[PDB]
Amino acid sequence: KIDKNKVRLKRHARVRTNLSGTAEKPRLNVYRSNKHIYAQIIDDNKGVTLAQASSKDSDIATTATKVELATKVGEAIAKKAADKGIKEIVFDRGGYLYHGRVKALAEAARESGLEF
Amino acid sequence: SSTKNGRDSESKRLGAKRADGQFVTGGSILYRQRGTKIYPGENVGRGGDDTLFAKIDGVVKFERKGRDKKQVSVYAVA
Amino acid sequence: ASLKSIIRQGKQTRSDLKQLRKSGKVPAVVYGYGTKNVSVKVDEVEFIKVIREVGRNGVIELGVGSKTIKVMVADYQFDPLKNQITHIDFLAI
């Protein structure tokens, strides 16, 4: 192969010259795998993580292919995040094209109270 | 015989205008340069023709970050 | 054979080094196992009467405060216009 993860960190580093905002515009990480999708809200004030979702727990990831999770894993943050007291987020692509599972999570996040 | 030479451009005053540690105001010019010898840092904006200046008014620092690269930052409280 | 040195204590200026080499003695330093950077003086007329018995790579027994700490000759420092020796590096084995 051509190091599928080592090319993403090359693409992620050129996304994130701008987007590293703090304390009212936090990032919202995205990541993928062959099986899952991971996400967490962070901001760069020497390390603060506010909410962290996943798709490996005993709540989801018992269901069909990859996307009805990734539309309903957006609301796993979007339930917790505004109930932690966050609003006015910024989202990164994480190195991926805004498409498919990543396009599903972003649109589903602001439909249930995580405004942009 | 003759000379084909002489003929120079005059000058452009091109160096550090403020120094490390002093209170600079909201629009002071902090460096004049060709290219980016010294990068813009935080609360510092790189202008067109690469002459980096300050944005919020506070102290200045010239700080190093890489192997052979440098940056200029401005911090708020004095 | 073996040298027999003293300890060059304190630290002194370049004129006192320049008043030292007229008496013949060449400064040196010793490092290595447990020696921890002692500074000596080496007499050049006596230091060459050692080299023609053990070689340019031999083993000597340098007495730094009556401690024959069995050093080797690592580095010269030479001046070709005046034909002397300027600084010698010993390492303890």
Partner: protein, 136 residues
């Protein structure tokens, strides 16, 4: 006639001639050398004349390594001219020595032959040299 093929600039500033030699103080190939003790320029005609003088007395029974080369060119303007209005063309090529630098080396010949073979070349060079053998 020792000169470089191409130089990036034909008119250079004059080299500095005070201090002591940068490097090239020790005999490293041969067995007997000729180190200068005074500073001067040498202008590549007085190396054609001190090389051949060493060659004849040796009867070509050894090797000769010259360890300097004129890199820097030096200018001059023709006679009966006024000052200024330019800078003159290249006349020749110089090489700077400083006291300590080995000039010549020999190898493959005896000592008492080479000591009377380097004297025939120091009288065609300006500087005061002496006879240095190898580091032992």
């Amino acid at each position: 006639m020792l000169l470089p093929k191409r130089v990036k600039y034909r008119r250079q500033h004059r080299p500095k001639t005070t201090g002591r030699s940068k490097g090239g103080n020790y005999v490293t190939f041969g067995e007997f050398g000729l180190q200068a003790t005074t500073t001067s320029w040498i202008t590549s005609r007085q190396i054609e004349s001190a090389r051949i003088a060493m060659t004849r007395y040796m009867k070509r029974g050894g090797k000769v390594w010259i360890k300097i080369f004129p890199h820097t060119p030096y200018t001059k303007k023709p006679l009966e001219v006024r000052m200024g209005a330019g800078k003159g063309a290249v006349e020749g090529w110089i090489a700077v020595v400083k006291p300590g630098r080995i000039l010549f080396e020999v190898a493959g010949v005896s000592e008492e032959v080479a000591r009377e073979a380097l004297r025939l070349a120091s009288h065609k060079l300006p500087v005061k040299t002496k006879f240095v053998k190898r580091e032992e």
